[PDB]
């Protein structure tokens, strides 16, 4: 459905955050806020990701 690609690595300081690496393709699951979305990675893990760190796929 909706995929984004990581532009930068991200680890996050909150436990709800989904860490990722530049180049990863993530699927967007929910947009509870304008700049922080819930996404799923290629291993099926879920978490919050910062919109500025990704681009549309």
């Amino acid at each position: 459905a909706e995929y984004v690609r990581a532009l930068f690595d991200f680890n996050g300081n909150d436990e709800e955050d989904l860490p990722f690496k530049k180049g990863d393709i993530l699927r967007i699951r929910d947009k509870p806020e304008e700049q922080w979305w819930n996404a799923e990675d290629s291993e099926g893990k879920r978490g919050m990701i910062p919109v500025p760190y990704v681009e549309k796929y």
């Binding site: 690595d9 304008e34 700049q35 922080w36 910062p50 919109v51």
Partner: peptide, 9 residues
Amino acid sequence: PPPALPPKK
């Protein structure tokens, strides 16, 4: 380095 991390609401 990455862009600014947006604040969480």
